[PDB]
């Protein structure tokens, strides 16, 4: 009725990128401003997902490690799903994991072309 607990679509979100190339994301974000974030897929071995964010005209990349039915980009904490991982950084600064960075998720990649 009220609770929308009937299959959730992650692709519906504007921050959900498909099989995008590395060089592409670089050029795509190059035009976008700071605060822009996105998540692409990659057919790698240890890494399954790939995250990207723009900060101070610098396109950063974050590898996503998913194993043992759990998701996590670092080697300290774990998540139950990509959503929990995204929402965590969406509200909390990345400085916690990456001291070099101090930004958060605000606008998607397909926000404004």
């Amino acid at each position: 009725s009220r609770p929308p607990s009937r299959e959730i679509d992650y692709t519906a979100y504007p921050w959900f990128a498909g099989n995008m190339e590395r060089q592409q994301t670089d050029n795509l974000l190059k035009s976008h401003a700071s605060g822009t974030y996105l998540i692409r897929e990659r057919p790698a071995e240890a890494e399954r997902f790939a995250i990207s964010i723009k900060f101070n005209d610098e396109v950063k990349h974050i590898k996503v490690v998913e194993k043992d039915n759990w998701i996590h980009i670092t080697e300290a904490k774990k998540f139950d799903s990509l959503l929990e991982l995204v929402e965590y950084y969406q509200c909390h600064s990345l400085k916690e994991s990456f001291k070099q960075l101090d930004t958060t998720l605000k606008y998607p990649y397909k926000s404004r072309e």
Partner: peptide, 9 residues
């Protein structure tokens, strides 16, 4: 030919 990325460091 190796994954750099940001990484915790």
């Amino acid at each position: 030919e190796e994954p750099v990325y940001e990484e915790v460091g």
